[PDB]
Amino acid sequence: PSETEISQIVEWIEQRYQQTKAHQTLAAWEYGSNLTEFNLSKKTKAAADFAEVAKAVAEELATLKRRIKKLAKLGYAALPADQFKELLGAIASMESNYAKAKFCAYGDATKCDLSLDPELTEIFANHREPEELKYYWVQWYNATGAPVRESFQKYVELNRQAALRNNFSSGAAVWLNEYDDSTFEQQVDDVIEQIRPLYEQLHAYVRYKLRQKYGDKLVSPTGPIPMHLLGNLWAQTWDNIADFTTPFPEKKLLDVTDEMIRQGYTPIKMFQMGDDFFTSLNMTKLPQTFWDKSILEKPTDGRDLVCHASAWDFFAIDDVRIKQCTRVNMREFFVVHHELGHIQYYLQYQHQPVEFRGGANPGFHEAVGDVLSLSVSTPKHLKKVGLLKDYEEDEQVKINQFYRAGVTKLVFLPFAYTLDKYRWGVFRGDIKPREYNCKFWEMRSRYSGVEPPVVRTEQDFDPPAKYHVSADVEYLRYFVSYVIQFQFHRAACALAGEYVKGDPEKTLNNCDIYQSTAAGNQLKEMLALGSSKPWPDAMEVLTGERKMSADAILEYFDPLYQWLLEENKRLGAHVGWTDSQKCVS
Numbered sequence: 371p372s373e374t375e376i377s378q379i380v381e382w383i384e385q386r387y388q389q390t391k392a393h394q395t396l397a398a399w400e401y402g403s404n405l406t407e408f409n410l411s412k413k414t415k416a417a418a419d420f421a422e423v424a425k426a427v428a429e430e431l432a433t434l435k436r437r438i439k440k441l442a443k444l445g446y447a448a449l450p451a452d453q454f455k456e457l458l459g460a461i462a463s464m465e466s467n468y469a470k471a472k473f474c475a476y477g478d479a480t481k482c483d484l485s486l487d488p489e490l491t492e493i494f495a496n497h498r499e500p501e502e503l504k505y506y507w508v509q510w511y512n513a514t515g516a517p518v519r520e521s522f523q524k525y526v527e528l529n530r531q532a533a534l535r536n537n538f539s540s541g542a543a544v545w546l547n548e549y550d551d552s553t554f555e556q557q558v559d560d561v562i563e564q565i566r567p568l569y570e571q572l573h574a575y576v577r578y579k580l581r582q583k584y585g586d587k588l589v590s591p592t593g594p595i596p597m598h599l600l601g602n603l604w605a606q607t608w609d610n611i612a613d614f615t616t617p618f619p620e621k622k623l624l625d626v627t628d629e630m631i632r633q634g635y636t637p638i639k640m641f642q643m644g645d646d647f648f649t650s651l652n653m654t655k656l657p658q659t660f661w662d663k664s665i666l667e668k669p670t671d672g673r674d675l676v677c678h679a680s681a682w683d684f685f686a687i688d689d690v691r692i693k694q695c696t697r698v699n700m701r702e703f704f705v706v707h708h709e710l711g712h713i714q715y716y717l718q719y720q721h722q723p724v725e726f727r728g729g730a731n732p733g734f735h736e737a738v739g740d741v742l743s744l745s746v747s748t749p750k751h752l753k754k755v756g757l758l759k760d761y762e763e764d765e766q767v768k769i770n771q772f773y774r775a776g777v778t779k780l781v782f783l784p785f786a787y788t789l790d791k792y793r794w795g796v797f798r799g800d801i802k803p804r805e806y807n808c809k810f811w812e813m814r815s816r817y818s819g820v821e822p823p824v825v826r827t828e829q830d831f832d833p834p835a836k837y838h839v840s841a842d843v844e845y846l847r848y849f850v851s852y853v854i855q856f857q858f859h860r861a862a863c864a865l866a867g868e869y870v871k872g873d874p875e876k877t878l879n880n881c882d883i884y885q886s887t888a889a890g891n892q893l894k895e896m897l898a899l900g901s902s903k904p905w906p907d908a909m910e911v912l913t914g915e916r917k918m919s920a921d922a923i924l925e926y927f928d929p930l931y932q933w934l935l936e937e938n939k940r941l942g943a944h945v946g947w948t949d950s951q952k953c954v955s
């Protein structure tokens with residue numbers, strides 16, 4: 371047979387394999403927004419009904435050769451139907467336990483309807499009572515972590531079996547194989563080192579001021595930071611305390627909260643301003659199928675659902691939905707853009723076959739939305755839209771401008787790095803089950819300098835307390851994002867004439883790229899490829915480079931770096947930390 375002959379058959383397998391994706395995807399959405407035993411029994415069926423399809427599509431099998439092997443990645447479909455159900459069953463048992471968790475208020479046993487979103491999320495983000503933050507910290511982990519230890523161990527062994535039947539060493543080889551570059555696990559390690567001098571200086575700064583506020587008894591000047599004081603359950607972002615520990619408080623903030631309240635903001639209003647951005651870039655306009663079938667507010671009926679913001683692609687055409695329990699605050703506003711970046715990416719490669727209907731690599735997907743967040747963060751873009759007015763950006767302000775960006779986005783790179791670095795150690799057998807917990811906190815202490823609020827033990831199993839852990843969702847994507855999103859932001863700040871390496875008062879940190887079609891067109895082209903071309907090619911269409919480069923982000927925070935170096939010295943603050951003793955064996 372000729373080239374077209376083999377291609378004439380794949381297209382017949384493209385659709386047949388693409389329909390059961392939507393069936394399995396739609397059934398996954400039902401259980402995603404309506405946690406019911408009935409919906410779980412239907413999600414796993416469409417999955418099993420799908421695995422039967424992928425299993426058969428494999429044996430039945432330049433662009434061509436890619437498809438013949440890009441459509442056969444079983445994933446977990448290599449296991450027998452009984453083990454396939456057993457794997458997804460253990461996973462859902464963790465995600466279910468994660469989204470259904472409810473808690474009793476601190477000091478009130480009669481009120482026991484508190485949930486992660488909104489109560490717990492906003493308690494940590496705004497309460498400055500240590501004993502309270504600690505109480506909710508233990509309650510959250512003892513409820514979402516250890517109770518699913520047994521289900522997790524089952525999920526691991528089957529994830530490893532699937533990796534073997536797919537011809538791989540362990541689960542780690544799978545997630546890494548997604549980036550298709552044996553020299554990538556080492557690339558990441560290199561970038562973290564390039565970031566360590568900056569993060570530690572910022573870490574020391576935060577710790578000292580956290581010691582100012584709460585006192586020395588609660589914050590050791592030489593030990594890791596109690597993570598429950600960083601305004602976030604997982605300490606992945608410290609934005610919720612940026613104002614609480616700001617360099618110069620007698621300055622203008624960038625909360626953009628009350629001015630969202632004053633101007634009567636609604637969850638739908640926010641998403642509109644997001645659609646308003648992509649359109650200005652000559653990109654896709656948010657369709658109506660999204661306005662209808664999406665969930666942009668926590669349902670006030672009482673069902674059980676996964677409030678963890680997400681964006682879905684049911685394949686087919688133009689059916690894009692976002693499930694986010696939105697609230698009125700600046701933090702949520704950026705969460706929207708991250709989800710919209712996922713929706714946009716769907717609309718760009720929807721004209722591709724089922725194989726190439728995905729981002730170049732997991733990093734691109736997560737990065738898209740945050741790239742706009744970089745421009746929105748700027749006062750320039752916030753000043754255009756009333757949210758930000760009378761903002762006399764001084765030199766100090768630009769420090770707070772660089773500071774917030776650090777405690778918000780910089781501290782997240784070490785966090786995202788440790789997550790997958792740990793799971794890889796569990797898949798590769800480097801972490802025995804008898805030491806699951808204290809090896810996790812050992813990494814969190816080493817690479818982020820934060821420790822639990824109370825002494826944990828191996829009886830506890832805290833990793834599942836993170837959504838992505840209980841849901842089996844790779845997190846390195848979020849790390850790669852925070853590295854490439856500055857490269858994209860760079861090549862997008864240059865095509866909008868908003869960045870020239872050296873530009874004094876036209877900084878790469880104040881680069882607002884609204885109404886830039888040239889940047890959009892080039893962005894549309896990269897997203898259009900999806901998984902059609904290797905990610906180096908997609909990497910080049912927009913950035914011009916073909917490798918992940920920390921030069922962008924390193925240039926972003928260098929102004930903050932120089933102020934921390936000079937400031938930590940004067941403040942007489944300690945840098946670095948001793949090992950954490952908050953986990954015993």
Ligand SMILES: *[C@@H]1O[C@H](CO)[C@@H](O[C@@H]2O[C@H](CO)[C@@H](O[C@@H]3O[C@H](CO)[C@@H](O)[C@H](O)[C@@H]3O)[C@H](O)[C@H]2NC(C)=O)[C@H](O)[C@H]1NC(C)=O
Pocket residue numbers: 404406407408409673
């Ligand atoms: C969350 O999922 C559950 C599934 O366990 C949904 O229950 C289902 O609700 C629909 C109606 O929304 C039921 O269909 C109805 O059947 C009656 C006859 O009994 C018919 O007259 C109605 O026109 C409608 O077709 C369905 O039977 C029911 N399934 C089960 C197993 O109870 C629930 O509605 C979902 N929640 C939300 C908020 O969507």
Ligand SMILES: O=C(O)[C@@H]1C[C@@H](C2CCCCC2)CN1C(=O)CP(=O)(O)CCCCc1ccccc1
Pocket residue numbers: 402678679680681704705708709712736841843848
């Ligand atoms: O909160 C977190 O932990 C991270 C970081 C944060 C992000 C946006 C705000 C600014 C900081 C970075 C938000 N988020 C997300 O995972 C949101 P998603 O759309 O990727 C959610 C991706 C998971 C999709 C899924 C759902 C069900 C089954 C399988 C897969």
Ligand SMILES: [Zn+2]
Pocket residue numbers: 708712735736
């Ligand atoms: Zn994402």
